[PDB]
Write a protein that binds this ligand. Structure first.
Ligand SMILES: [Cl-]
Ligand SMILES: [Cl-]
Ligand SMILES: [Cl-]
Ligand SMILES: [Cl-]
Ligand SMILES: [Cl-]
Ligand SMILES: [Cl-]
Ligand SMILES: [Cl-]
Ligand SMILES: [Cl-]
Ligand SMILES: [Cl-]
Ligand SMILES: [Cl-]
Ligand SMILES: [Cl-]
Ligand SMILES: [Cl-]
Ligand SMILES: [Cl-]
Ligand SMILES: [Cl-]
Ligand SMILES: [Cl-]
Ligand SMILES: [Cl-]
Ligand SMILES: [Cl-]
Ligand SMILES: [Cl-]
Ligand SMILES: [Cl-]
Ligand SMILES: [Cl-]
Ligand SMILES: [Cl-]
Ligand SMILES: [Cl-]
Ligand SMILES: [Cl-]
Ligand SMILES: [Cl-]
Ligand SMILES: [Cl-]
Ligand SMILES: [Cl-]
Ligand SMILES: [Cl-]
Ligand SMILES: [Cl-]
Ligand SMILES: [Cl-]
Ligand SMILES: [Cl-]
Ligand SMILES: [Cl-]
Ligand SMILES: [Cl-]
Ligand SMILES: [Cl-]
Ligand SMILES: [Cl-]
Ligand SMILES: [Cl-]
Ligand SMILES: [Cl-]
Ligand SMILES: [Cl-]
Ligand SMILES: [Cl-]
Ligand SMILES: [Cl-]
Ligand SMILES: [Cl-]
Ligand SMILES: [Cl-]
Ligand SMILES: [Cl-]
Ligand SMILES: [Cl-]
Ligand SMILES: [Cl-]
Ligand SMILES: [Cl-]
Ligand SMILES: [Cl-]
Ligand SMILES: [Cl-]
Ligand SMILES: [Cl-]
Ligand SMILES: [Cl-]
Ligand SMILES: [Cl-]
Ligand SMILES: [Cl-]
Ligand SMILES: [Cl-]
Ligand SMILES: [Cl-]
Ligand SMILES: [Cl-]
Ligand SMILES: [Cl-]
Ligand SMILES: [Cl-]
Ligand SMILES: [Cl-]
Ligand SMILES: [Cl-]
Ligand SMILES: [Cl-]
Ligand SMILES: [Cl-]
Ligand SMILES: [Cl-]
Ligand SMILES: [Cl-]
Ligand SMILES: [Cl-]
Ligand SMILES: [Cl-]
Ligand SMILES: [Cl-]
Ligand SMILES: [Cl-]
Ligand SMILES: [Cl-]
Ligand SMILES: [Cl-]
Ligand SMILES: [Cl-]
Ligand SMILES: [Cl-]
Ligand SMILES: [Cl-]
Ligand SMILES: [Cl-]
Ligand SMILES: [Cl-]
Ligand SMILES: [Cl-]
Ligand SMILES: [Cl-]
Ligand code: NA
Ligand code: NA
Ligand code: NA
Ligand code: NA
Ligand code: NA
Ligand code: NA
Ligand code: NA
Ligand code: NA
Ligand code: NA
Ligand code: NA
Ligand code: NA
Ligand code: NA
Ligand code: NA
Ligand code: NA
Ligand code: NA
Ligand code: NA
Ligand code: NA
Ligand code: NA
Lengths: 645, 645, 645
């Protein structure tokens, strides 16, 4: 209210009575300021329930001109027990981004740009009151991650990567964060555009102006060429360069970094461009002092007092540092501007501003594990390059699903040009994830692991000596639908076990050579057809045995030679024929029929005639009958399957 | 001894003569102090053999009260050649933990708590003279590692992780390190419990008290929730939170970190609790100045001079900073307390103390290798989750064995719910070990490697084109007991070789389809039994050959049809039967017998009669005899095995 | 030129007129100096095209003695607008290595030593004007990498690892960088070798000398033992120690680090030696002040004024810090040495100098990928330990080939003593490379990956459910010369497919047991020979069928028993024999011949006689003829192969 006169402070509560003596306000464009206010006043006790966590309003004035009325947060404050004759305080102010320093997350941003990624940490826990004075387009980040760090640390490092900076466009209603870059972004007052300069010849003057200049210049790197890798296009022209030479000795000495974190070429030519431009602020920076109360970090002006036709040009004030000083009364009615002071760091226009990086790159010093993800009913979610998708064990955003990550590559055992090893991670099983050069924005899947839900395949903690690979039917995980190859290396009990869950189809292009040292037992269920082109040879050192349980059937287009070295019997019920190596043919039946279309000869070298001689019976020796054969076949697999109870 | 009067210093050698003027002693609870002593004295030369590496004794006095007689180590000292009129020195003191700064290890601690882990680096190279004033229980660490770092750096970071701090309980006999936490741990003198406060109205007073207060306060993070991963229980409620709000604006803004390094839940609720509590020291800290010689870092007191009913409460002095000043003689007989000075940082009780972390977390910036271990006679030491145990190549503690590590997980190629790849590392062979997020307390096994003792399986540095897997018999490593699958990819000489060290058991659930393009040679040693359920079909385009070396035996329950398209001979020594497609049956023997139980018919379409006609002999064409057959069988494998000499 | 008198500065342009007042020159042996020159002069505008990037020449003089005429680079310079009454400037000088600070590379050095590795970054972008005063030999580095960092940062960290340091041997022609170590490397003037010392009793003297001493000493670590791993010799005595004790309390307290980055033993005993020696500079350092204008960092001298027989010995000045001061005219004709000042840090000889390390070790915080390399025509380049060679995606040095790297080990899935897994990376396919403990000089290959040129083997992005391994013919990558094992896990359509690109050779040591649940179809191209030692048993539950397309041939040394349970026919064109289980033998032909060498009997139990009875024809039932059999064989694989158009 309180127009007696003199001191008028509010927004959130500020007494008009409470006087101010000193301040000390540093800042840099793209950094926080701090205003070292030392107060003194009447009040003994005021609360802490807001004022420590909420604004103050300051009012710096160039009357008849660009008032600078201020409004910003209190973040550290104190009182002082030196004088019980009147209060004394301290009060350092810092802007609203500071209140994103004392905070911390682990959060993933996807398919967003790195201006409007920063809008959300603002908006979700804050206002819309910031502004946009950007002009070119930047990169729309596929996958950006605020890793472990503080939201304030997060936003600024990204702004620094992209050349965005900021300042506070000072407003009489609502405070403002100016998201900016380049000439056509900043702005300044009228008639004020050109500010004075004068050596105050009698020590001091009744006037506001400049009384100091210094132009410091260091040598700066000449060119920062960049390079990255691109597996999408593993042949492409990866290199990118930037160059801003000004004409002098020992200038164009080059820099070079690998991972500049780019995918597409032109974007890497921007990044080299932004980081090259920041370092060239240092090339030429200028140092001033004046008693003028209009300018501050971010402001543009033009100097006219220390002249050169085009030395003193446009000037963006980067870091204004200033002071207030007074021990003022209502005495000597009047009293005017009790002394002030300022100091300055400026630049130009065709020579433009960028921010120097200075922050640890979120320090992911080793691998994590993650669940390879997709909720129920699913088992396989890959892509064309054998990529999968994961949730890291830090997600308060979904029941991890196809949105938990970008696609992540897998590190196979053996991988070549459309040939080599492949086992893609199923959904729900855990992996090892590394990070290329340790960047939390660049996962890569580098191995698998077993846990309590995803348990080892075999008998553990027991047959450690077994090894192999066993798969699982997909869509349907029944604890035994699987193809497996398993080598067991336990002495005396070694084995190689191959299990085809359905069908097996072995193809050998030239020759094959099965050698078994003891026995083979082959048992096929329904049918075998074996076919061999040219010749089939079968040699058995001892007894060859064959039981047919149906009709046996043998066709030979030419000749079938049946040779014995002892004896040949064909026994067929009551009709038994027997050929012997001594040469005695024996035949028994129950009748016989002998027919020749043409002729028949029966001859000897002894006697023949007819009747009496051939045995009364040459018996079939028991076996002959069909029932007997049955069981020599059927003594097979008619097995039990009792049933449980 | 030397009671003239005035200055009385000893333990390790201190002259009574040698006067002291200045000191400057800073400390913080949980940090080292340093006392900037500038001496002057008689002596020109005294040695360096101890005094630089050993104590001094100081004596600060509040006579008629709490004397503070001191005893601590010298760690940096100097003399000064300004005056040959009397000596001048410097002497900065620091406590005994400093003498664990200039040291360094790489050592593993197992199944120990993180109070009494610190007891050993103390005790093994030092004393038992420290104390314990702790009250709650902390975590008993399964696996804790002092990685590369200094013993002083090791102990303090752990104390900082667990909320333990310290101070020195000042003793007239033997110096003391107070391992502490919470109210019921600290302590203080009597009647001294309440110390004075007075603005020394005539500049100065004949009295000891306080003459300054300042209560600085910053805004602090509102809550640090934590989260970790737990593969033992990969479904569990990992999250843990902590909260200490005091009522003000912009307060309850949260923090969040992942790996807080916890296994079990409650312990993570402590860690969030300890780290949240440290940051809330900064919330409210108080700054004092007095001329009183009783208090120091760690001391508790209660102020009474600057009052508020409950503003000035209990006060644990966190960091006392103080001064001595004198140029004193035995003149103006008397002379009293030549001036002193102190400064202070205090806290309360229901608002309790914790340490701010500030030390690099032992910087394991990449993987190591390690030997997977167990001394002789052993080959396989795993557990239920397919874990093994390693020694890292830095052990001066055992011939590495089952105690070298905690169990470490392995990174398989393919791992799923009781299905997937397994090859567990044998004892003696080397691996690659990564560290989760780069923490030296969290190894994980991530790959294998060959070395000079553990050599590549094949012909190296030669058949680079071969690949595969070969196992080894376990318990018995004979350079050829093994199951192997080996693909060789050299053009013209390609091969797939499968080797079963004992037994092979292939199971196909539906169908199988072996196609070989050239030849197969199958040779079984002892027996084959092949059985097919339904039908067996065998078709050969050209000559089918069979040699039996024993008894051939063929049974068919129904019909055996034997069909030829040219000719059928059965030759049996001197009895040869020959059926021909034109229809001429030829039979030769040495006798024949023909019998029919019932009837016999012999018919023609030409003539028959008896005798003269059938050949004198239709010869067996040489082959018939048993000796011949032998060699057609036996021309097999009766091989040599000469013998070596 | 300009001998009026007084001030004589040049090389690159320096006016004789332009006066100098202050300087402030700090340095440390093994670091850059900086000379804080504040100028004042006539000139308003001089250019910037060289002078900022090029030298100045200073001339410090001890007339009648060791002149110190200087010549060094300007790197940051400024002017000042305070006085338009005469100019004012600043000008900080720094040596020529500074101009390797504002630069950056990622470059590999191979089979070179770490003195003459530094020669090239010098020589390729600079002069030969440096010098060599080294005496012992150092390590010839197999593989050294300047990773990301600045050339100045690169050279100094390596010099610090090896104990080399430097200073500038000040020359009247051409400036000099002294690459040095040990006593016999430094040097100094004559008669000057011993410099004075005097307390300037009337405040000041007409003379140059010392007027201050201080000998500061801290306690230092007692011994730094080292240890590394050596897979070449995985059993060897890795440990190495160093020790320099001087006699005092709390001294011999040890250090220990693992990776000291050594291969061979003695070299690690040097590294422990160099790093132990640096820390023992701090053990004893000495602080001086004089008005003498001959000495500077690197200079050796001997003090004689503050005596002790052997306290004041040889003195290598490590860091001289000095000053100039004057506001001089040509007035009071004469005027002499307008005042100067210096300050000092010295050491000795038998106690020798080394550099303290202080630089981030190039921070490779995670893995890269790389192409495993060798240009066209090649597919496999390995060594004896299964190592390959890579180019990292940052090479501007070759079309990456056998010189791109040192040999790098691969991380197999399973690796043991001449047994275990092997798939060595082919040339052109990409890998994952980690770095042991994150050192850019120690790659290790830790996994594979697919990209756009090196594509997945199968149907992607489709049969994700298939897995396996497929190789490729080497020397000849035809998109189907390969051995493959492939498990397909899709329900109802599961399969195990084995493909041998040429030959397959399965060996089973004891038994084998093929069980197929449905059918087997085996088709061999040319020949099969099957042989079984003892007994072959074949049982078929239903119909056994055999078609021979050539000559069938069966030999049995003993007996062939042919048994039927229904009937046996042998049909051979027009001659059909039929034996039946009731006992009726039926024979039909077109003639028959029956012969017995000895006797013949034909008998019955009914009637016989001759003629009338046996059938007019028992027909062959159609099948008998050879054409029919043909197609029962030949209905096989006479397939089409139409042709494309
Ligand atoms: Cl009034
Ligand atoms: Cl108010
Ligand atoms: Cl600054
Ligand atoms: Cl008041
Ligand atoms: Cl607000
Ligand atoms: Cl879109
Ligand atoms: Cl969000
Ligand atoms: Cl763009
Ligand atoms: Cl607003
Ligand atoms: Cl507005
Ligand atoms: Cl091009
Ligand atoms: Cl340009
Ligand atoms: Cl990166
Ligand atoms: Cl591109
Ligand atoms: Cl542009
Ligand atoms: Cl008045
Ligand atoms: Cl411009
Ligand atoms: Cl930092
Ligand atoms: Cl849920
Ligand atoms: Cl979704
Ligand atoms: Cl499943
Ligand atoms: Cl099953
Ligand atoms: Cl044979
Ligand atoms: Cl008979
Ligand atoms: Cl019978
Ligand atoms: Cl006396
Ligand atoms: Cl003494
Ligand atoms: Cl502090
Ligand atoms: Cl004396
Ligand atoms: Cl002691
Ligand atoms: Cl226990
Ligand atoms: Cl121990
Ligand atoms: Cl507990
Ligand atoms: Cl003791
Ligand atoms: Cl005691
Ligand atoms: Cl619950
Ligand atoms: Cl609480
Ligand atoms: Cl961790
Ligand atoms: Cl729990
Ligand atoms: Cl509690
Ligand atoms: Cl006296
Ligand atoms: Cl309390
Ligand atoms: Cl640090
Ligand atoms: Cl031993
Ligand atoms: Cl043991
Ligand atoms: Cl073994
Ligand atoms: Cl063998
Ligand atoms: Cl067929
Ligand atoms: Cl005949
Ligand atoms: Cl014959
Ligand atoms: Cl003259
Ligand atoms: Cl000139
Ligand atoms: Cl220093
Ligand atoms: Cl002039
Ligand atoms: Cl030059
Ligand atoms: Cl050579
Ligand atoms: Cl080069
Ligand atoms: Cl050597
Ligand atoms: Cl030169
Ligand atoms: Cl020369
Ligand atoms: Cl030995
Ligand atoms: Cl020695
Ligand atoms: Cl290393
Ligand atoms: Cl060695
Ligand atoms: Cl030596
Ligand atoms: Cl004159
Ligand atoms: Cl010496
Ligand atoms: Cl640093
Ligand atoms: Cl090219
Ligand atoms: Cl080459
Ligand atoms: Cl190929
Ligand atoms: Cl093919
Ligand atoms: Cl059987
Ligand atoms: Cl008939
Ligand atoms: Cl017919
Ligand atoms: Na806010
Ligand atoms: Na004037
Ligand atoms: Na040039
Ligand atoms: Na679920
Ligand atoms: Na048939
Ligand atoms: Na049986
Ligand atoms: Na000790
Ligand atoms: Na008074
Ligand atoms: Na609220
Ligand atoms: Na042994
Ligand atoms: Na039989
Ligand atoms: Na043979
Ligand atoms: Na140079
Ligand atoms: Na005198
Ligand atoms: Na001792
Ligand atoms: Na090419
Ligand atoms: Na034959
Ligand atoms: Na057909």
């Amino acid at each position: 209210m309180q127009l007696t006169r003199l001191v008028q402070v509010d927004c959130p509560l500020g007494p008009d009575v409470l006087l101010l003596q000193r301040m000390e306000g540093r800042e840099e464009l793209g950094r926080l300021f701090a205003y070292e206010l030392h107060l003194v006043s009447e009040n003994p006790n005021l609360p802490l329930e807001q004022l420590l966590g909420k604004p103050m309003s300051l009012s710096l004035e160039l009357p008849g001109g660009s008032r600078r009325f201020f409004h910003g947060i209190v973040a550290r404050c104190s009182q002082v027990a030196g004088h019980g004759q009147f209060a004394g305080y301290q009060a350092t102010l810092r802007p609203w981004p500071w209140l994103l320093t004392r905070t911390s997350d682990c959060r993933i941003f996807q398919n967003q740009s790195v201006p409007e990624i920063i809008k959300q940490v603002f908006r979700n826990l804050g206002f819309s009151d910031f502004e946009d004075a950007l002009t070119r387009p930047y990169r729309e980040w596929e996958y950006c991650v605020q890793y472990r760090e503080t939201s304030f640390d997060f936003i600024s490092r990204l702004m620094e990567q992209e050349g965005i900076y900021y300042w506070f466009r000072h407003e009489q209603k609502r405070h403002i964060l100016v998201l900016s870059d380049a000439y056509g972004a900043h702005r300044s007052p009228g008639g004020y555009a050109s500010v004075p300069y004068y050596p105050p010849t009698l020590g001091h003057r009744e006037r506001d102006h400049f009384f100091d200049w210094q132009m410091a210049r260091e040598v700066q790197p000449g060119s920062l060429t960049l390079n990255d890798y691109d597996f999408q296009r593993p042949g492409a022209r990866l290199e990118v360069r930037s160059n801003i030479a000004r004409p002098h000795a020992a200038a164009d000495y080059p820099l070079y970094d690998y991972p500049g974190e780019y995918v597409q070429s032109q974007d890497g030519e921007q990044y080299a461009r932004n980081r090259i431009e920041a370092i060239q602020a240092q090339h030429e920076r200028v140092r001033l002092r004046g008693v003028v109360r209009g300018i501050g970090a971010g402001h543009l002006f033009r100097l006219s007092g220390y002249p050169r036709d085009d030395q003193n040009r446009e000037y963006l004030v980067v870091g204004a540092e200033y002071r207030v000083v007074q021990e003022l009364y209502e005495t000597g009615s009047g009293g005017a501007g009790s002394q002030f002071e300022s100091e300055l760091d400026c630049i130009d226009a065709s020579q433009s501003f960028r921010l120097l990086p200075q922050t640890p790159v979120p320090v992911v010093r080793g691998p994590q594990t993650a669940v390879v993800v997709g909720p129920k009913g699913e088992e396989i979610w890959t892509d064309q390059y054998g990529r999968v998708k994961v949730h890291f064990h830090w997600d308060r955003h979904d029941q991890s699903n196809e949105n938990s990550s970008c696609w992540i590559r897998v590190s196979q055992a053996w991988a070549g040009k459309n040939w080599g090893s492949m086992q893609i991670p199923r959904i729900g099983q855990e992996v090892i994830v590394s990070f290329l050069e340790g960047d939390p924005d660049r996962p890569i899947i580098t191995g698998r692991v077993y846990n309590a839900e995803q348990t080892v395949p075999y008998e553990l903690p027991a047959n450690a000596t077994q090894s192999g690979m066993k798969s699982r039917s997909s869509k349907g995980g029944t604890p035994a639908n699987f193809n497996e190859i398993r080598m067991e290396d336990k002495k005396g009990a070694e084995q190689l076990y191959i299990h085809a869950e359905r069908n097996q189809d072995n193809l050998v292009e030239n020759d094959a050579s099965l050698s078994v040292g003891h026995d083979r037992n082959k048992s096929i269920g329904h049918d075998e057809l074996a076919r061999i082109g040219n010749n089939r040879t079968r040699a058995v050192k001892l007894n060859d045995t064959l039981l047919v349980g149906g009709a046996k059937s043998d066709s030979v287009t030419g000749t079938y030679l049946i040779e014995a070295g002892a004896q040949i019997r064909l026994v067929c019920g009551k009709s038994v024929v027997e050929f012997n190596a001594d040469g005695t043919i024996n035949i028994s039946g129950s009748a016989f029929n002998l027919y020749a279309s043409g002729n028949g000869n029966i001859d000897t070298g002894g006697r023949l005639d007819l009747n009496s001689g051939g045995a009364s019976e040459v018996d079939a020796k028991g076996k002959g009958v069909q029932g007997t054969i049955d069981g020599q076949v059927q003594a097979m697999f008619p097995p039990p399957a009792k049933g449980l109870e």
